[PDB]
Structures are given as structure tokens and as C-alpha cells.
Nucleic acid binder design. Structure first.
Ligand SMILES: [K+]
Ligand SMILES: [K+]
Ligand SMILES: [Mg+2]
Ligand SMILES: [Mg+2]
Ligand SMILES: [Mg+2]
Ligand SMILES: [Mg+2]
Ligand SMILES: [Mg+2]
Ligand SMILES: [Mg+2]
Ligand SMILES: [Mg+2]
Ligand SMILES: [Mg+2]
Ligand SMILES: [Mg+2]
Ligand SMILES: [Mg+2]
Ligand SMILES: [Mg+2]
Ligand SMILES: [Mg+2]
Ligand code: NA
Ligand code: NA
Ligand code: NA
Lengths: 88, 100, 153, 187
RNA sequence: AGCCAGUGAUGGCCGUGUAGUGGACUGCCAUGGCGUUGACGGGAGCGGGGGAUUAGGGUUCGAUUCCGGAGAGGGAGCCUG
RNA sequence: GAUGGGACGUCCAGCGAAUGAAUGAAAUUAGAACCAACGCCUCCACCCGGAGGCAGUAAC
RNA sequence: AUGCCUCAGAAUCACUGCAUUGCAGGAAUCUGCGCAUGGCUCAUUACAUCAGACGUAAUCUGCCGCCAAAAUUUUGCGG
């Protein structure tokens, strides 16, 4: 069933090799999820969402710069027109 | 560089809908203070002039964030001196008289 | 009650398929005079790159010429040549002739040569043999055509 | 196989060109799709540089645009009535670009009722929608030919996509002098 | 000393095919396009940077190291990319 | 009853591809008067209703 | 005469060396990339190829550089 230990149920095969004690061979278990792998998966999403957020910040600063320049140009034009009106 | 806001006696109401509110219901909002002219500006905000500079200070208090037909009624203090508006008005009347 | 009904021209619509410009919609009546000539008709025209002026015939005409430099999607880029009109027999095409002198080094003298080129001519121009024309390079338009007439002098 | 080079052609002088080198894959052509009209069927083709072209075989529906109103609807094609290449294409019912076809007019009738309130369910509408209808109808005018066709149940259109290259049969309704030009031929 | 058009020859119109332009290709229309400033046909030959001979002008060679093209007995077709 | 103002809910609203519509600027002349509604400024201390005019004014 | 393994895709060789249910090296196979380059020759070839000057607004482009990314009702338990 789910959430059950599997690391010791894997069988081991004994190889009787001459000149030494018998070697015991056990396969490497695939798709074993630990806490370090869980943290590794969860870091990708949070890193990605920070990148799109800092790109929105960069866009906002550019828009503010464009708007400020156009505000100054309008203010200069109004001052010229205002001076012309009062000089009449 | 003194703050130009204190001692103003002029208030600013942010969410006021002139198409569904009328001036009578606007004036009711403040009942214990004498009310001067009221202005609305189609961007949903309004300006209210008060008689005494000692007023509008506790009106800014205990009214920011309170409910007024919804919309939470953000309110602050504005320069908008009544005396300078009167001089602008009489200059405009003089200027229009010269033009016509 | 109902919108007015236009009529076919009958002087330019003499083919099996309806002739139209692909850049504008002649059935759209808009409040902006983006593409409108002096007569009020909807007509697309543009300015080609170099110091060449769009003829008034192109702006105020009624032909179609999907191969025209001024009223279509043909773009002028490359090299500019001049020549003399040689023959105007084909439909919307003419042959120009270029005459030049070639230098032979051994004899220190010149000899005469020539070359014939076939180009596309818009209806806004009406060249005759003996005339002088200026042509500009464009994308391949036929088996042998690589140039378009830009100005008749 | 099929090639698209100028090596097999005569020179302008009329002489014959002596061919050296063989045929290159970069200049191949392919057999035409010859799209008919029927239930949908497509065939992928792997083109140069990867990428897939879609061959149209027996298409029967598409998106058709009402240019004057700047809208479009999904409609079913009924038949082919004209072709500027040859009558053989009309006889064999082949869908190509610029073919003149007819469509069922049901989607366009439904859109007109819900946008202008004119039926060629309307009376069950909100008051603010009814007010909006009056504005739209105040300075909008339909034309004779379009209104007659919508009442009848079919209207003419021309194919704008290339069915053999994209596997889609899209088009635009005929209006203006173009409608008159093709009505006179169809007589 | 004339060449090119049934079966594309030169141009036009709507299309198809292509990664894309184009008689590249299907249908229809007109009679055009090239040539004694040597077309069409025939002979020798991979093109160039360069080598040899040097009063100067020239004559002649370049299969071969670098650049470009083509081919893998002949000739045709194609899959994967 | 208002192309009236705010909520509420119910379908769409990512890159790329297909068709249709709009945008992808302007650069050949100077002052006035009425009516529609839109924006502002003055009254009659405000409100009520019932008056009269363009000081200013990127847009929303 | 064209193959390629790093600390970093996949070993239970019934493979080897030390330990004693492990640590290393790892034959073979699957997977990813390359084999359209280099080398050879000069048969064909005169509006062809090539050279000097220009174009692609008529297009395709793996490896390499600088960059971008807010679509999507999934899983477990009790029904
Ligand atoms: K064409
Ligand atoms: K590959
Ligand atoms: Mg030879
Ligand atoms: Mg050589
Ligand atoms: Mg030899
Ligand atoms: Mg040698
Ligand atoms: Mg050798
Ligand atoms: Mg080869
Ligand atoms: Mg041999
Ligand atoms: Mg290793
Ligand atoms: Mg492999
Ligand atoms: Mg090679
Ligand atoms: Mg070169
Ligand atoms: Mg999401
Ligand atoms: Na794993
Ligand atoms: Na030679
Ligand atoms: Na080579």
C-alpha cells in the first residue's frame, strides 16, 4: 500500500564466490522520493514565479519613465500658452 | 518646507457617485458642522468646504475607512483655500467683462 | 431604409474574375480618410523608397495592376538602371535597350555593345519607342522580368 | 520526381540547355491535393526544416467573415457555383482559393437577431439590451442583396484560405459591386 | 543564317505546388521573344587566385596544395534527418 | 421609461497558427452665431428649485 | 580508413578487487549526439560554372550567444 517502507522488502541474491564469503546483490530502487527531492521539486516553482514578478517590476519602471517625460512636455507647452494668453 | 495641508478646513471625499447620490445626501454625512459650497467632479470624488479651520480635523479622523453606501469612503485634507477661490472668481469675472 | 448599391465599372472589369486590390476593402465606409483620393473612392497607394514621386495618375486612377510599384505589394530594392524604349507590343510590358562601350586593352580602343531587358510597365505610364525610362529592381515577376518602370522622361 | 527548376526550359534565344548535375531535393514539387467537398479528412506532410503542412481532402465547413459588421461565424458549405479557372472545377466540386460557394445563413441570422433585435426569443430581452438595440439600429443600414439572401436562407461567399496548404476552408461573404458582378454571371 | 509555339515559345488573368519568387505547373487570352554588335549549330575545355618568357606592348600554360562547382561503374527513384 | 451609476453571477479573455475588421500620424487660411448633451465656473449662507456664462482645462 | 562516458541518463553479468546484506571498477545492451565534415578525382559543362560588385521586403536554418515564460482542477481520504 501507499506510504509503506520498501527499502528492506527488496530481495537479495547470494553469489557463492570462491576464496571469499558469498556476495549479496540487491538492485538499486528507482522512483524513491525523499525529503530532499521534495524540496528540490518545490524550489523550481517558487524560483520561476519570482522571475515573472521581477519582470513586471521592470515594466512598471519603464512606463513611469515614459509618463514622466510626457508630463514635463505638456507642462512646458501649457506655460508657453499661458504666458501668451496673459500677454494679450 | 512646511506641510501645506494643516489648517485647511477643506476635505476630500474619494468614492462619491454624483449620478446616484445627490447633494442632499452628501451634506447629511456631516451634521454637526456648518457646510460651505460642495463640488463634484465626475471622477467620483468631491470637495467640501467648511467654515472653521478647527473643523475638518476630527472629521478626517473617525471617518477614514467607515462605510458610506459602500466603497469605504477614503477621506483626506486638501489645500483648496476658499479665499483664493474667491479672488480667482472675481478675476475671471473681470477678464470675461473685458473680453465681452 | 437600405444602403445604396454601387455598380460595376465595366471599363476595367473585363476578365473572368473580379479584379480588386488586396490591401483595402472597397465595401467599408469609415469615418477616417486614411485611403481616399480626391474623387472619394477607396484606393490604396504608397510611396516607394528613393527620391521618386508617386504619379497623380496612380493615386487618382482606376486600374488594378497587382504588379504596380505604387499600388501593390511589390517592393523596389537593388539597383537602378536607365534605358531607351525599344518595343511596346506586349500587354503591360516593354523592352528597353542599353547601349555601352567596351574597352579592348590590346588595341587601346573601344567597341559598341548592347543588351535588351524586358520590364513591367504600369498603366500610369505611357511610353513610346524612342523614350527614356528609369527602372528599379524587384522580385522575379515572370520568366524574364526583374525590373519595374519608375519614371518616364 | 517533380522539380521546379529552370533547367528543362528553353533559353530565350530558343536554344537547348545542356544539363550537368542531377536533381536536388531542394527543388522538389508535390502532387496537388484536389480538395473535394465532404466530411473532413486530412493528411500530414513533413515539409522542409521540420514542420507539417496539412493537406485538405473533403472539407465541408469553416469560418466565414461578414466584413461590414467585422464578425465571423462557423457555417457549413452547401455547394460550389463558380470558378474562374474552368467549368471542370465547378463540375467536379473542387474547393480552392477564390472559389464562389454558398453557406447556410443560419448562424448569421441568429447573430443579427441578438445584435440588432431584428428577426428575418427576441421579445424576451432585458430593458437595457432593448435600449442598446435602439442605438445600434439608429444609424445602421443593411443593403438590398444581403437582406434578400438572409431571408431566403443562403448567401454567396468566396474562399480566402488555401485548403491544400493549411487544411482549412475559410472565406468572406460577397458584398458591394463584387456581389453584383457574380450575380450577373450566375444567371 | 535564320532560331523558338501540336506537347510553353514571349507576355497577361484567377489558381496549384514550393521553405519561399517565378510558365515551375493546370485552364483561358494576345502574337509575341532572339539574331551580322554573329543568334542557332559544331570543335577543344572544370572556373578563378596564379605559373613560364620580361625594354615596353604582348604570347602561352593553369588535371594538381587555397576558394567555388560536380561525381562515386552507368543512369533513375527514395527514407531518415 | 433612461446607449443612467454601482454590486452580484455566467460564458470567454496565455505563446504559436488560420480568416475577416481597426490602428501602424500630421505637415496649402483666419474670425463668428444658433441647437443637442458633455465638462467647468458663479449665485440666491448650504439643501430644496431655478437661475447665467466660458477663467482655466493631456487623456480616463 | 567514424565513433563518443563525466562528480553529474539507465547494471542483480549467474564479472573482478577489497569488506562481510557494503564500497569501487565496470563487459554487454537501451538512450542522447555525430557520420551531409574531412580525403579523392576532373568525366560532364558557354545567358551553364566562375570572378568582381549587388539583393532576398521571396525564404528555411539543429549545435552556439543574449534572453523569455502567471493558459491547463491534479493527488489522497470518506462517499
Ligand atoms: K501568380
Ligand atoms: K539531426
Ligand atoms: Mg573534360
Ligand atoms: Mg584548376
Ligand atoms: Mg583530362
Ligand atoms: Mg604538383
Ligand atoms: Mg593526384
Ligand atoms: Mg554527391
Ligand atoms: Mg572505376
Ligand atoms: Mg566513473
Ligand atoms: Mg542510438
Ligand atoms: Mg567535401
Ligand atoms: Mg564573389
Ligand atoms: Mg495556473
Ligand atoms: Na531515479
Ligand atoms: Na584552361
Ligand atoms: Na569543391
Amino acid at each position: 500500500g501507499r506510504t509503506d517502507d520498501v527499502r528492506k522488502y527488496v530481495i537479495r541474491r547470494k553469489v557463492t564466490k570462491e576464496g571469499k564469503k558469498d556476495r549479496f546483490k540487491a538492485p538499486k530502487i528507482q522512483r524513491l522520493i525523499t525529503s530532499t527531492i521534495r524540496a528540490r521539486r518545490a524550489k523550481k516553482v517558487r524560483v520561476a514565479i519570482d522571475k515573472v514578478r521581477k519582470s513586471a517590476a521592470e515594466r512598471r519602471e519603464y512606463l513611469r519613465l515614459v509618463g514622466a517625460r510626457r508630463r514635463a512636455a505638456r507642462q512646458r507647452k501649457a506655460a508657453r500658452h499661458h504666458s501668451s494668453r496673459v500677454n494679450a | 518646507k512646511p506641510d501645506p495641508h494643516e489648517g485647511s478646513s477643506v476635505v476630500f471625499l474619494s468614492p462619491i457617485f454624483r449620478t446616484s447620490t445627490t447633494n442632499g445626501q452628501i451634506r447629511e454625512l456631516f451634521t454637526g458642522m456648518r457646510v460651505l459650497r460642495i463640488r463634484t467632479y465626475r471622477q467620483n470624488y468631491a470637495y467640501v468646504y467648511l467654515d472653521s479651520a478647527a473643523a475638518a480635523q476630527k472629521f478626517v479622523k473617525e471617518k477614514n475607512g467607515t462605510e458610506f453606501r459602500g466603497k469605504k469612503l477614503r477621506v483626506a485634507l486638501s489645500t483648496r483655500s476658499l479665499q483664493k477661490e474667491k479672488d480667482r472668481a472675481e478675476r475671471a469675472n473681470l477678464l470675461s467683462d473685458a473680453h465681452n | 431604409n437600405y444602403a445604396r448599391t454601387p455598380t460595376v465599372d465595366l471599363t476595367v472589369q473585363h476578365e473572368k474574375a473580379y479584379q480588386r486590390q488586396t490591401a483595402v476593402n472597397e465595401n467599408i465606409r469609415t469615418a477616417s480618410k486614411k485611403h481616399v483620393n480626391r474623387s472619394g473612392h477607396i484606393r490604396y497607394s504608397k510611396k516607394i523608397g528613393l527620391g521618386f514621386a508617386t504619379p497623380k495618375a496612380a493615386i487618382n486612377g482606376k486600374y488594378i495592376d497587382r504588379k504596380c510599384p505604387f499600388t501593390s505589394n511589390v517592393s523596389i530594392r537593388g539597383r537602378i538602371l536607365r534605358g531607351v524604349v525599344h518595343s511596346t507590343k506586349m500587354r503591360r510590358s516593354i523592352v528597353i535597350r542599353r547601349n555601352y562601350l567596351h574597352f579592348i586593352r590590346k588595341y587601346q580602343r573601344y567597341q559598341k555593345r548592347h543588351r535588351n531587358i524586358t520590364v513591367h510597365c504600369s498603366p500610369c505610364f505611357d511610353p513610346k519607342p524612342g523614350d527614356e525610362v528609369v527602372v528599379g529592381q524587384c522580385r522575379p515577376l515572370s520568366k524574364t522580368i526583374r525590373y519595374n518602370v519608375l519614371q518616364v522622361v | 520526381g517533380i522539380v521546379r527548376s529552370r533547367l528543362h526550359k528553353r533559353k530565350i534565344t530558343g536554344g537547348k540547355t545542356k544539363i550537368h548535375r542531377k536533381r536536388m531535393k531542394a527543388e522538389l514539387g508535390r502532387l496537388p491535393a484536389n480538395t473535394k467537398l465532404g466530411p473532413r479528412r486530412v493528411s500530414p506532410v513533413r515539409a522542409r526544416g521540420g514542420n507539417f503542412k496539412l493537406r485538405g481532402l473533403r472539407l465541408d465547413t469553416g469560418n466565414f467573415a461578414w466584413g461590414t459588421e467585422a464578425s465571423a461565424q462557423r457555417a457549413r458549405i452547401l455547394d460550389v457555383v463558380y470558378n474562374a479557372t474552368s467549368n471542370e472545377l465547378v463540375r467536379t466540386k473542387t474547393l480552392v482559393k477564390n472559389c464562389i460557394v454558398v453557406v447556410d445563413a443560419a448562424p448569421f441570422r441568429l447573430w443579427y437577431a441578438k445584435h440588432y433585435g431584428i428577426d428575418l426569443d427576441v421579445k424576451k430581452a432585458s430593458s437595457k439590451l432593448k435600449r442598446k438595440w435602439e442605438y445600434r439600429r439608429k444609424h445602421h443600414k443593411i443593403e438590398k442583396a444581403l437582406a434578400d439572401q438572409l431571408r431566403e436562407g443562403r448567401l454567396l461567399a468566396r474562399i480566402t484560405s488555401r485548403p491544400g496548404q493549411t487544411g482549412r476552408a475559410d472565406g468572406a461573404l460577397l458584398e458591394g459591386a463584387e456581389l453584383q458582378f457574380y450575380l450577373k454571371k450566375l444567371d
